[PDB]
């Protein structure tokens, strides 16, 4: 897993550019945004590309307990290929974008101001994350 601490947190404008190979037969992956290092923290959003299940997943977590899942329209994302996420933050939610298409709105649930970390997990290999 990888994890990018967020010195100046995320404020409206902060752009998340998250690149990455899903590798064969891959299974699931997540991006998260977290409100503390501690494991089980509060996640502001969790961001879940299901190849598996060809879902993708947007939710919350608050005291160990998840939120009601909202599900993307498709799935973009392919095993075998590249991607590039835009996570953008704006007053009211997360803004979505995969590829050169925006995909999803994630009306905020958590505030803005208790996001401290990235975490990227599960079958994704990683090229980089990148705060904007
Ligand atoms: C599929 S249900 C649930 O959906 C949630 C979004 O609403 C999350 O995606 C949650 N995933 C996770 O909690 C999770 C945590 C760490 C890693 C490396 C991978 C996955 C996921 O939990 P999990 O995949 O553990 O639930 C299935 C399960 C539960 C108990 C025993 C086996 C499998």
Same mark, same amino acid.
């Given at each position: 897993?990888?994890?990018?601490?967020?010195?100046?947190?995320?404020?409206?404008?902060?752009?998340?550019?998250?690149?990455?190979?899903?590798?064969?037969?891959?299974?699931?992956?997540?991006?998260?945004?977290?409100?503390?290092?501690?494991? *089980?923290?509060?996640?502001?959003? @969790? !961001?879940?590309? &299901? /190849?598996?299940?060809?879902? $993708?997943?947007?939710?919350?977590?608050?005291?160990?307990?998840?939120?009601?899942?909202?599900?993307?329209?498709?799935?973009?994302?392919?095993?075998?290929?590249?991607?590039?996420?835009?996570?953008?933050?704006?007053?009211?939610?997360?803004?979505?974008?995969? *590829?050169?298409?925006?995909?999803? @709105? !994630?009306?905020? &649930? /958590?505030?803005?101001?208790? $996001?401290?970390?990235?975490?990227?997990?599960?079958?994704?290999?990683?090229?980089?994350?990148?705060?904007?």
């Amino acid at each position: 897993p990888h994890k990018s601490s967020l010195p100046e947190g995320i404020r409206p404008g902060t752009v998340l550019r998250i690149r990455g190979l899903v590798p064969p037969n891959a299974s699931r992956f997540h991006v998260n945004l977290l409100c503390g290092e501690e494991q *089980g923290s509060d996640a502001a959003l @969790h !961001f879940n590309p &299901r /190849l598996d299940t060809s879902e $993708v997943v947007f939710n919350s977590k608050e005291q160990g307990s998840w939120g009601r899942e909202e599900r993307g329209p498709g799935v973009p994302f392919q095993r075998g290929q590249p991607f590039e996420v835009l996570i953008i933050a704006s007053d009211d939610g997360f803004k979505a974008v995969v *590829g050169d298409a925006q995909y999803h @709105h !994630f009306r905020h &649930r /958590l505030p803005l101001a208790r $996001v401290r970390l990235v975490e990227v997990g599960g079958d994704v290999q990683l090229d980089s994350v990148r705060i904007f």
